GROMACS .gro file of C-alpha atoms in nm:
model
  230
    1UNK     CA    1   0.000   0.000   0.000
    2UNK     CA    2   0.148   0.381  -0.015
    3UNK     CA    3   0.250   0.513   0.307
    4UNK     CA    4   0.019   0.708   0.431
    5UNK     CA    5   0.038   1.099   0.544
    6UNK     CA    6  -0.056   1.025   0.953
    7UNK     CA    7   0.177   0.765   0.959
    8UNK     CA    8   0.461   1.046   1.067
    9UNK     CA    9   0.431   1.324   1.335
   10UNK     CA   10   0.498   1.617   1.114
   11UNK     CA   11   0.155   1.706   0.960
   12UNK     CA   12  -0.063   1.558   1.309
   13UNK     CA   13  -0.178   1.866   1.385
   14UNK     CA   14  -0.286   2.009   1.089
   15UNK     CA   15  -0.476   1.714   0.989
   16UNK     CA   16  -0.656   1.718   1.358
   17UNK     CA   17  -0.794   2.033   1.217
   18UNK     CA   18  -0.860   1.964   0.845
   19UNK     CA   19  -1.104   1.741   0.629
   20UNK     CA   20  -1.022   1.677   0.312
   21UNK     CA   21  -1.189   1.732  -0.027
   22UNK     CA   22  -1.136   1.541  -0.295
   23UNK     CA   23  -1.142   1.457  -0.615
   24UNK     CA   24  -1.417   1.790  -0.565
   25UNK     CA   25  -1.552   1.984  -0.280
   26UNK     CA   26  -1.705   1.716  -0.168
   27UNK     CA   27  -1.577   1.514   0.130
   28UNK     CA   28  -1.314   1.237   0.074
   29UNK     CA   29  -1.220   1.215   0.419
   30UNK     CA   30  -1.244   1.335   0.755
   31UNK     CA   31  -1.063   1.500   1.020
   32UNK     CA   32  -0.985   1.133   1.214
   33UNK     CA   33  -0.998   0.968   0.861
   34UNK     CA   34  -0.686   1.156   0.795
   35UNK     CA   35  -0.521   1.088   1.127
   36UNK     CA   36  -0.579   0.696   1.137
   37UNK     CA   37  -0.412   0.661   0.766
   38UNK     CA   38  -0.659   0.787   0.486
   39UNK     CA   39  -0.396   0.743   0.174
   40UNK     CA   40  -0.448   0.704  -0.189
   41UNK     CA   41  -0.275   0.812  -0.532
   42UNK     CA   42  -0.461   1.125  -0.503
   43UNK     CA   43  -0.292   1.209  -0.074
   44UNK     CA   44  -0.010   0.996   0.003
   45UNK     CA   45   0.351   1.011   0.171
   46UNK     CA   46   0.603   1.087  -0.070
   47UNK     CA   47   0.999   1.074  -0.026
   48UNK     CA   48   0.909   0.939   0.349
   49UNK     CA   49   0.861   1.315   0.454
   50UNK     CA   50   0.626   1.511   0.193
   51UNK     CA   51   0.230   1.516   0.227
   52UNK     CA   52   0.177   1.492  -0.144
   53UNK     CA   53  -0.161   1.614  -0.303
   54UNK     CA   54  -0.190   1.469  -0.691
   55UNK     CA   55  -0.528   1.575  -0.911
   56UNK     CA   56  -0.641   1.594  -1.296
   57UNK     CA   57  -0.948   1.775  -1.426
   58UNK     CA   58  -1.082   2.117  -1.432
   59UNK     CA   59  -1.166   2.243  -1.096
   60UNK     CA   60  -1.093   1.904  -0.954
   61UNK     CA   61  -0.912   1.918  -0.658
   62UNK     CA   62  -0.756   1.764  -0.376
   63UNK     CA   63  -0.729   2.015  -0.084
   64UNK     CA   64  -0.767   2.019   0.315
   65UNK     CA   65  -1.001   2.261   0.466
   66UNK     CA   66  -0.956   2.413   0.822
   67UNK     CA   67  -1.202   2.253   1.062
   68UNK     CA   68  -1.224   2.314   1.456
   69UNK     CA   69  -0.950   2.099   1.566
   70UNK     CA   70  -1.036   1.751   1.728
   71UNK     CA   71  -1.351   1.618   1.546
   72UNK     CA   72  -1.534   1.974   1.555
   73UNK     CA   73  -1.733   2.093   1.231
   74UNK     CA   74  -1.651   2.350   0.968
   75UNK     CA   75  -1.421   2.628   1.116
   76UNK     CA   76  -1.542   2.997   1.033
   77UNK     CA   77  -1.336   3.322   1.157
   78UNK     CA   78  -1.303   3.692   1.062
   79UNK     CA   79  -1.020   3.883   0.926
   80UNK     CA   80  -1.054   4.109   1.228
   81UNK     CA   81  -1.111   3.935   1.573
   82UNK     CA   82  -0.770   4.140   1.673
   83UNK     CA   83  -0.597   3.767   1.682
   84UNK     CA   84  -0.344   3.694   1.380
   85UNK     CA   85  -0.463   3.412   1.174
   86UNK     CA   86  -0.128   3.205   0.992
   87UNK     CA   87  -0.129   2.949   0.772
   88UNK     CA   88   0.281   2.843   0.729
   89UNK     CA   89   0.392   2.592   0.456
   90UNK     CA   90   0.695   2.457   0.306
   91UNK     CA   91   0.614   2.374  -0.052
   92UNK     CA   92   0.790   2.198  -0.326
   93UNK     CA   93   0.612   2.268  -0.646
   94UNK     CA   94   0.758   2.007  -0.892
   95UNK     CA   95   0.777   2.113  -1.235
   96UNK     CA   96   0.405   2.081  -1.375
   97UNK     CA   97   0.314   1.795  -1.675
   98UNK     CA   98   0.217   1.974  -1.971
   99UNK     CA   99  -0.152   2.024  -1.968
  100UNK     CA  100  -0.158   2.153  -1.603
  101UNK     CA  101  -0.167   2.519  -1.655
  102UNK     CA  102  -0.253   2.705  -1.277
  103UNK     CA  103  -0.270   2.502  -0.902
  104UNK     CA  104  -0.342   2.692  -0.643
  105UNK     CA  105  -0.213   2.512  -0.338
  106UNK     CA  106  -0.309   2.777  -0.030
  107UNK     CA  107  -0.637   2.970   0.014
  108UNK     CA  108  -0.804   3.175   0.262
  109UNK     CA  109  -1.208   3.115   0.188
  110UNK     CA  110  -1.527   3.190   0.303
  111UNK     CA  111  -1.920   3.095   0.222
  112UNK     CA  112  -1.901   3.326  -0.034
  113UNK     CA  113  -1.609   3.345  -0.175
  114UNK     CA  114  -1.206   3.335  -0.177
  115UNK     CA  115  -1.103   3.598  -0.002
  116UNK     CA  116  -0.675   3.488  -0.153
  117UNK     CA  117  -0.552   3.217  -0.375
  118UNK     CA  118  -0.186   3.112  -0.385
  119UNK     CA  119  -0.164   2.938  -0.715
  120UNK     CA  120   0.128   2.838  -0.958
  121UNK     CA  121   0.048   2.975  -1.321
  122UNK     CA  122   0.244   2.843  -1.623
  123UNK     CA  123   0.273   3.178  -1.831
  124UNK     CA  124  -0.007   3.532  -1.739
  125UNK     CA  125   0.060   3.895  -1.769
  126UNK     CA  126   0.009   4.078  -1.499
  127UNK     CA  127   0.027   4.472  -1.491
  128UNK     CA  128   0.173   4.452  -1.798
  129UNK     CA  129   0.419   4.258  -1.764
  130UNK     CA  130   0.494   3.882  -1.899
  131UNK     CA  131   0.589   3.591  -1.605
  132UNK     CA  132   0.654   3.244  -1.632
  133UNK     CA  133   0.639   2.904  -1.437
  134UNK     CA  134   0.566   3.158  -1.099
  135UNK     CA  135   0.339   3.136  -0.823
  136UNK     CA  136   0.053   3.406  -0.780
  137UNK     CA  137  -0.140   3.581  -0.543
  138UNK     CA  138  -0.515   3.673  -0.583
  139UNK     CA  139  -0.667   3.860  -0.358
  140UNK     CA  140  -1.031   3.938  -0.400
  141UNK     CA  141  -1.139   4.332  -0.271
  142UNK     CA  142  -1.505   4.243  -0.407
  143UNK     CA  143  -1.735   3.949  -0.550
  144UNK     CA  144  -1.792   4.080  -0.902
  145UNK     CA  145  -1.586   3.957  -1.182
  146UNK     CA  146  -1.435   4.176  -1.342
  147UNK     CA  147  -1.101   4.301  -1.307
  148UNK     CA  148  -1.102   4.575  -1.002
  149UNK     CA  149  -1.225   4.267  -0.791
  150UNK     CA  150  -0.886   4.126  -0.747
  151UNK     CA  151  -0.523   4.207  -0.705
  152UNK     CA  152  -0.302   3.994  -0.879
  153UNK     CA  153   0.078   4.016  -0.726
  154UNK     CA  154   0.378   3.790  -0.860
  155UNK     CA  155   0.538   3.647  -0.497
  156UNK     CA  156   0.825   3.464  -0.673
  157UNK     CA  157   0.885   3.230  -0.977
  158UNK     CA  158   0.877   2.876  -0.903
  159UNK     CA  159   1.224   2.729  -0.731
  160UNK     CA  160   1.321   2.374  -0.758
  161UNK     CA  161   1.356   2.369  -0.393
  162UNK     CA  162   1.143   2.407  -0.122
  163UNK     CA  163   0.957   2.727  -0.069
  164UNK     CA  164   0.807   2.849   0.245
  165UNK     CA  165   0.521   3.085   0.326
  166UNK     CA  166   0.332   3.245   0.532
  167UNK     CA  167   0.025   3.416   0.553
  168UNK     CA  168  -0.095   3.637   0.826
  169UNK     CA  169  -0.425   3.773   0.872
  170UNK     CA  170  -0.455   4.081   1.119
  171UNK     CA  171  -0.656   4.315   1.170
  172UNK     CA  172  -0.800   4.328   0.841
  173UNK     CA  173  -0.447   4.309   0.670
  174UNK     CA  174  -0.294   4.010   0.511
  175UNK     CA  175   0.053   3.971   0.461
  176UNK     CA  176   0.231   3.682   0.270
  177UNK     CA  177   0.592   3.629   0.356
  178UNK     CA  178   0.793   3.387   0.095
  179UNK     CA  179   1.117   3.235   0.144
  180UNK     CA  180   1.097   3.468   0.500
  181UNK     CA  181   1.079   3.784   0.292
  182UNK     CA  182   0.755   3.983   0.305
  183UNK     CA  183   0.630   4.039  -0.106
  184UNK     CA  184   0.269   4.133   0.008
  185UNK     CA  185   0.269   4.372   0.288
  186UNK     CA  186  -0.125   4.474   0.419
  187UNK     CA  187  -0.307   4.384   0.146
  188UNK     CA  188  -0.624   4.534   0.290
  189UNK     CA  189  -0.941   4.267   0.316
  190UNK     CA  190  -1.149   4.527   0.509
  191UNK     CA  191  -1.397   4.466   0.219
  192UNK     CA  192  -1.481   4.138   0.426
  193UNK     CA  193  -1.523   4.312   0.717
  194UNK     CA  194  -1.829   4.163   0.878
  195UNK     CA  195  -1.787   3.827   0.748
  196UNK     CA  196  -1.731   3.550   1.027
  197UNK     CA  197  -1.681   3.212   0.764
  198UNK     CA  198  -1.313   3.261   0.657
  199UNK     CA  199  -1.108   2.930   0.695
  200UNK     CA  200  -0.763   2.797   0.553
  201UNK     CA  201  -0.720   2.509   0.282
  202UNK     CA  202  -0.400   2.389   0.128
  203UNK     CA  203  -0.337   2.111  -0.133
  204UNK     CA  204  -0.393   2.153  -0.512
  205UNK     CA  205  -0.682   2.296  -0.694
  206UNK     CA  206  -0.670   2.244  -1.066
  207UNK     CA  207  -0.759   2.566  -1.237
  208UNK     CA  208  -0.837   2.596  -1.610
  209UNK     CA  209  -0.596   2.282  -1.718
  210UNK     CA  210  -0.573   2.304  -2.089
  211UNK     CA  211  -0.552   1.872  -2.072
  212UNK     CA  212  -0.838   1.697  -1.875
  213UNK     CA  213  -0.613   1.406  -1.831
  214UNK     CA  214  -0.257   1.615  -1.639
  215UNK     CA  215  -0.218   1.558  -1.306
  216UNK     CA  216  -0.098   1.880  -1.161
  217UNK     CA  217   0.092   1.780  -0.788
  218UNK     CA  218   0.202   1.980  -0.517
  219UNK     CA  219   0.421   1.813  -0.220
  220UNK     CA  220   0.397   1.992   0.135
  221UNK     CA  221   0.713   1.945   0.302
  222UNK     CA  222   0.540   2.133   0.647
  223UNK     CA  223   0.183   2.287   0.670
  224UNK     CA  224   0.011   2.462   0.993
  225UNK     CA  225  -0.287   2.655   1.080
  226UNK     CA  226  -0.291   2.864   1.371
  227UNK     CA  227  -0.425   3.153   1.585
  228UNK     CA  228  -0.163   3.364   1.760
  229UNK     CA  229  -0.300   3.540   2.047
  230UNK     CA  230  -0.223   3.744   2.380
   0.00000   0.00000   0.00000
């Protein structure tokens, strides 16, 4: 069988506060599913150490979302309780089988909407100005669609190593560190001020493949969801 993610200390305590979703939003497996050895193709232990998330299809996915930790139900929280809300990963984003063409691998999210997707993108513009094989921000300052809902911010192109972040929710601010360097510093959320349903989610979320058949896969060397407080 493949070695399965709870079989090793290091991701415990995320998964005691995560279900996960797969191969849609629907449940694949729960909080203590995860923690007494849920594994598959799709979530699986990779080089002994990496909690692996593998997915093909358009808006497939295969992605843990934050729960209240020990068996509770669907977390919800608001950008501006005063506490900071951080979500910290160490990510190695192989390169991506042709066909696979965005995965975005963090999120903050609410009922509504998400409120920030970290994705990798093959090839966009972005103010103008061409990037390839990078990882993204989106940041949604409304729920329309067109353009002025979002702000779109290159955080770094894609290493071959492992790359950390970290994103920090206070106070109605976000800020997403990369590699220990801050690249988005306050993004202001204040237009979901009000809403109480934000929660994490991490794995990999197939966006617009151009290939129903590529299986875009992200490996999570660490991942943790937190609330720092007084």
């Amino acid at each position: 069988f493949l070695t399965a993610v709870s079989s090793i200390d290091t991701f415990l305590p995320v998964l005691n506060e995560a279900k996960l979703q797969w191969p849609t939003s629907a449940l694949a497996a729960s909080s203590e599913e995860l923690l007494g050895g849920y594994v598959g193709s799709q979530f699986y232990l990779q080089d002994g150490k990496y909690m692996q998330f593998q997915i093909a299809g358009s808006s497939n996915r295969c992605e843990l979302r934050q729960m209240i930790p020990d068996g509770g139900s669907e977390i919800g929280w608001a950008v501006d309780d005063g506490t900071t809300h951080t979500a910290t990963s160490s990510i190695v984003v192989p390169e991506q089988v042709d066909g696979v063409e965005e995965v975005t691998i963090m999120q903050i999210h609410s009922g509504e909407a998400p409120q920030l997707r970290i994705s990798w993108i093959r090839s966009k513009s972005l103010d103008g100005v061409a990037y390839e094989d990078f990882i993204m921000s989106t940041v949604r300052i409304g729920t329309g669609d067109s353009s002025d809902n979002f702000v779109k911010t290159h955080l770094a192109d894609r290493t071959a190593g492992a790359m950390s972040f970290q994103i920090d929710v206070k106070d109605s601010k976000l800020t997403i560190t990369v590699n220990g360097n801050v690249v988005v510093n306050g993004q202001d959320l204040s237009f979901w001020d009000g809403t109480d349903s934000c929660y994490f989610k991490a794995g990999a979320y197939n966006n617009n493949p151009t290939s129903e058949s590529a299986t875009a896969r992200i490996k999570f060397a660490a991942l943790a969801w937190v609330d720092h407080h007084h």
